[PDB]
């Protein structure tokens, strides 16, 4: 009796997970496997304004390269390895310190906001929209990570049981 | 004043570079080993266009004689106009002209590569008024094709910051049945889009149809049509560096060759004339300019935007003439072509125009056009391919010198992406 | 008296300043340097030598007036040219250039790298604007640096300098009238900051002036060289009658006090008489009457509002040249009482009107030669709703048929100031509805 109600809770947790999960990961997912709507917005902008030059400093910092040095990301993009190392910082493997940096600073300012920035740009609005929900599914995937923990820990106990 | 650098790419960029080479020194008064025949004002200001005056009124060139083999330097440092300086500015260095775009693109081209670089990672430092660089290309073989897209990847890398403008000729545009040839060649168009920023592509057959009709001669030497070209270019350049109010720069000139974001093609037409180079009567006047623009035959690269629209212009001039005479005839011309230019801008119209001549010429212009509609050249490259894809016996060679199937397929979507990007600039 | 330092940018601007200054010293006689050898001569200004002796002097000789240009030529024709002695090198400034037709490059991109040399200039002249009364600018307006450069600084003047005199001096075809589809979009955004920012500008209609050069003064070739020429002709005919001779000498803060009567800059069209060809092959030399009918002539009066409609407000026409009483009461009278004129129902007086009692002096072979009498016009029409609706369509029309605006933010400014902008110009487009149909 005890592992068949193993069983349905590990089944309740996976069910919390499933009502954020479909819509976050089609966001994810939409950019990982770069769609020509999306390449093309990120293609634009020869001169960002004000906010939004504070917005690719912030993409540079996910870049390696600390701030927005134009030169340098007027070469990398137009190379095959931009998009790459930038998803690299997508999901849970968006660091911790990132996720701070961006949340305690950059989503605890106006000036890098869904409001300013979509303001600023058409283009630059829905990126902050996207990266802002993938930066919160990133977050997700780490404090919301104890109910997946907790999926998988009622997995393994419940396979534990199986054979004691 | 501007001091442009010129890179000549193959032996096609070299023909064109040199022809325009004996023009432009003489119109700015450099005269062959180096001396002085000037005294008007560009053959004083303006002058140090590709140039340096130094040592007693000679002139150290600022695009330097740089070739790879020995007897090609011979015909450049015999000049005429590029004997010019002691032995700082002679380079050269290596050889090319190889085939199969694989090892061109990798193992046989990486040490051409190396043999450029240095050279030009040494220049490229130490001109401080460098407006940008004049580019010119050659299709040549494995090096041409293969080594030439190479090359500019390691270019554009190295400079994303400098103002690069790319003179491309062609053979007639994909123009003849190819074999397997299609999967590689779009894979080198794809190397094309993804390291160019301001390109212009030049027909050969267009210009010996123009040689066999406008210019009265049955023998198209290429040599030949390459100066006409360039020393209509000498009217082109310095046009803009001359004063007058249309004469624009920087900022504006980039956004009126792109209207919408993607890398454009740039086709130059022709434009005053019934001849150059034949007759004693070859026409000059404004009704005789907006002739050849308004008109199909003379401009280059057989893929025709024109049907599906006429899309955007500039023409160049030189010469006295009377601006409302210019826009009025331009009235008319225009009334012509319309909505249909794009139906979401009626017209489409743009000018720069100077006071004073170029050389002999009393009025001269050129005239560019752009690209839409032109989907048709992409098609074709598709179906020449279906023969020699279904009975192929050949892809092998670029594949075991370096290729693989995944860059084939990723740029065969690329040429279908413009097949839509045109199709769409239809719309 | 006399006049006040005179700022000039633009490619006609400067021009419209240097064909002026040839009629100042055409009207002096002034020599290039010394010494002028008369007692004592005037045209810039009253007194003549150590040259220019305009007003500012003494030095290498201090400048009324600064040119702001790119071009070396123009340094040549004033350095080893006349007006050697009447500038300094000094403030002769030439520069370099980068072009756009762009707000945000000339605001921001260009703007913010070229400035403080020139700001270090212009806070000078406001500390030393000799004569007095305030900033007069030519423009400019349509540019990159015209329309955003001119954003940053007029703000920056109407800031630091509210109680002073600004007159805004621009050459613009009319709302919507010029060919291309996108070309009011980097200045709808001036309009709109100038829309509250501004008070004074006079306006010359470019496709006006064109058309009036090739068929009414009938020239072979118009060129921008002969337009320069043209409409510093046209402003010297109100600066150089005005300024402090034989003249009603009318002191430019207490006609704006008749330009603005009412909150907003309420501009004037402006256009000039003798622009055509009798006139200039030498004509009559015509009544106080007949010279306002010469200013009436076809296309010499705008048809932006229909030819005699649109809610006259006002015209203030201002009558160069020794003149008789009597006529100068029938030239304003009988237009109004012909009443042809369509003039708004809460006031249809026109009493607005300028005369000024000096011949032309200058020496015939331009477009302006000596003279007994002239005339400078302005109209002031109620029903402008046109204006302000056509740049409101004119910005859309390129839009309802493809996207666009990226372009300008690639440029460094925000996206949604354009949309609030055509916004506003249709929002006022109803308030000038308001005030063309009037009471």
Same mark, same amino acid.
């Given at each position: ?92 493997? @968006? ?36 990266? @802002? ?32 | ?63 330097? /004689? ?44 990486? &040490?051409?590569?190396?043999?450029? /670089? ?36 390691? =270019? ?30 779009? /894979? ?68 009126? #060759? ?8 740039? $086709?130059?037409?022709?434009?005053? /004339? ?24 003379? $401009? ?20 006295? #003439? ?33 006071? =004073? ?30 023969? #020699? ?13 370096? #290729?693989?199937? $995944?860059?084939?397929? &990723? ?17 | 008296?006399?006049? %006040? ?19 100042? %010293? ?10 002028? *050898? ?8 009253? +007194? ?135 070309? *009011? ?40 060289? !002969?337009? !320069? ?44 008489? *003798? ?22 002539? *076809? ?5 932006? %509002? +229909? ?7 006002? %015209? ?12 100068? !009461? ?36 331009? +477009? ?27 910005? +859309? ?43």
């Amino acid at each position: 009796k005890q592992q068949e109600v193993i069983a349905d809770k590990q089944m309740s947790v996976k069910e919390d997970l499933d009502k954020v999960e479909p819509a976050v990961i089609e966001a994810q997912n939409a950019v990982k496997s770069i769609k020509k709507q999306h390449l093309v917005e990120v293609r634009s902008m020869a001169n960002p304004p004000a906010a939004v030059k504070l917005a690719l400093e912030s993409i540079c910092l996910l870049l390696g390269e600390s701030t927005t040095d134009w030169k340098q990301i007027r070469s990398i993009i137009m190379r095959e390895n931009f998009i790459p190392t930038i998803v690299n910082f997508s999901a849970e493997e @968006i660091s911790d310190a990132i996720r701070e940096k961006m949340k305690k600073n950059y989503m605890s300012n106006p000036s890098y906001n869904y409001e300013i920035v979509n303001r600023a740009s058409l283009a630059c609005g829905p990126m902050v929209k996207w990266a @802002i929900a993938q930066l919160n599914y990133a977050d997700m995937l780490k404090r919301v990570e104890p109910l997946r923990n907790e999926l998988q820990k009622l997995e393994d106990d419940a396979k534990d049981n199986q054979q004691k | 004043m501007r001091e442009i650098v010129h890179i000549q790419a193959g032996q096609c960029g070299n023909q064109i570079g040199a022809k325009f080479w004996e023009v432009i020194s003489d119109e700015h008064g450099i005269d062959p080993t180096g001396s002085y025949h000037g005294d008007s004002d560009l053959q004083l200001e303006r002058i140090n266009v590709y140039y340096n005056e130094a040592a007693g009124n000679k002139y150290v060139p600022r695009a330097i /004689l740089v070739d790879l083999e020995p007897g090609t330097m011979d015909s450049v440092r015999s000049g005429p106009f590029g004997q010019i300086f002691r032995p700082d500015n002679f380079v050269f260095g290596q050889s090319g002209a190889g085939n199969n775009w694989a090892k061109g693109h990798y193992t046989e081209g990486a &040490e051409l590569v190396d043999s450029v /670089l240095d050279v030009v990672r040494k220049e490229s430092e130490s001109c401080d008024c460098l407006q940008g660089f004049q580019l010119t290309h050659s299709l040549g073989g494995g090096t041409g094709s293969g080594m030439g897209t190479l090359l500019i990847s390691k =270019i554009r890398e190295e400079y994303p910051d400098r103002i690069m403008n790319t003179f491309s000729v062609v053979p007639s545009p994909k123009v003849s049945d190819t074999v397997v040839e299609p999967y590689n060649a779009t /894979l080198s168009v794809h190397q094309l889009v993804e390291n160019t920023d301001e390109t212009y592509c030049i027909d050969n057959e267009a210009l010996y149809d123009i040689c066999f009709r406008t210019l009265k001669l049955t023998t198209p030497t290429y040599g030949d049509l390459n100066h006409l070209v360039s020393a209509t270019m000498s009217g082109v350049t310095t046009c803009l560096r001359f004063p007058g109010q249309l004469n624009a720069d920087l900022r504006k000139l980039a956004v009126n #060759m792109v209207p919408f974001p993607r890398l454009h093609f740039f $086709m130059p037409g022709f434009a005053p /004339l019934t001849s150059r180079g034949s007759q004693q009567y070859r026409a000059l006047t404004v009704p005789e300019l907006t002739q050849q623009m308004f008109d199909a035959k003379n $401009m280059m690269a057989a893929c025709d935007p024109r049907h599906g629209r006429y899309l955007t212009v500039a023409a160049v001039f030189r010469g006295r #003439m009377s601006m409302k005479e210019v826009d009025e005839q331009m009235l008319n011309v225009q009334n012509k072509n319309s909505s249909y230019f794009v139906e979401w801008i009626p017209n489409n119209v743009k000018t720069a125009v100077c006071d =004073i001549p170029p050389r002999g010429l009393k009025m001269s212009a050129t005239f560019i056009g752009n690209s839409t509609a032109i989907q048709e050249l992409f098609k074709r490259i598709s179906e020449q391919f279906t023969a #020699m894809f279904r009975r192929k016996a050949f892809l092998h060679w670029y594949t075991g010198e370096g #290729m693989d199937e $995944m860059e084939f397929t &990723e740029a065969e979507s690329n040429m279908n992406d413009l097949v839509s990007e045109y199709q769409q600039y239809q719309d | 008296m006399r006049e %006040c330092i005179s700022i000039h940018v633009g490619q006609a601007g400067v021009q419209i300043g240097n064909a002026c200054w040839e009629l100042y %010293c055409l009207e002096h006689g002034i020599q290039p340097d010394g010494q002028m *050898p008369s007692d004592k001569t005037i045209g810039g200004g009253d +007194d003549s030598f150590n040259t220019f002796f305009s007003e500012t002097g003494a030095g290498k000789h201090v400048p009324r007036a600064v040119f702001v240009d790119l071009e070396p030529t123009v340094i040549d024709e004033v350095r080893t040219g006349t007006y050697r002695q009447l500038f300094h090198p000094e403030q002769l400034i030439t520069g370099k250039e980068d072009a756009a037709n762009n707000y945000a490059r000339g605001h921001y991109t260009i703007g913010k790298e070229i400035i403080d040399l020139v700001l270090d200039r212009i806070r000078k002249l406001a500390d030393q604007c000799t004569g007095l009364q305030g900033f007069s600018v030519f423009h400019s307006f349509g540019g990159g640096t015209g329309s955003g450069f001119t954003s940053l600084l007029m703000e920056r003047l109407s800031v630091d300098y509210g109680k002073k005199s600004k007159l805004e001096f621009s050459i613009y075809p009319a709302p919507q009238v010029s060919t291309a589809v996108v070309e *009011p979009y980097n200045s709808i955004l001036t309009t709109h900051t100038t829309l509250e920012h501004s008070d004074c500008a006079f306006m010359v209609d470019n496709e006006a002036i064109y058309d009036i050069c090739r068929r009414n003064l009938d020239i072979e070739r118009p060129t921008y060289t !002969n337009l !320069n020429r043209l409409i510093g002709q046209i402003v010297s005919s109100i600066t150089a009658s005005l300024r402090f001779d034989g003249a009603l000498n009318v002191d430019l803060t207490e006609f704006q006090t008749n330009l603005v009567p009412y909150p907003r800059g309420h501009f004037p069209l402006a256009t000039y008489a *003798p622009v055509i060809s009798a006139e200039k092959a030498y004509h009559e030399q015509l009544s106080v009457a007949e010279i306002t009918n010469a200013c009436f002539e *076809p296309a010499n009066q705008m048809v932006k %509002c +229909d030819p005699r409609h649109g809610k006259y407000m006002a %015209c203030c026409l201002l009558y160069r040249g020794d003149v008789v009483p009597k006529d100068v !009461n029938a030239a304003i009278a009988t237009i109004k009482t012909k009443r042809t004129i369509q003039f708004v129902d809460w006031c249809p007086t026109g009493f607005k009107v300028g005369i000024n009692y000096e011949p032309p002096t200058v020496v015939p072979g331009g +477009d302006l030669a000596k003279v007994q009498r002239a005339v400078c016009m302005l109209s002031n029409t109620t029903a402008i709703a046109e204006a302000w609706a056509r740049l409101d369509h004119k910005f +859309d029309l390129m839009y309802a048929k493809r996207a666009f605006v990226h372009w300008y933010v690639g440029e460094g400014m925000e996206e949604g100031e354009f949309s609030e902008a055509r916004e506003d110009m249709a929002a006022l487009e109803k308030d000038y509805e308001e005030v063309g149909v009037d009471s």
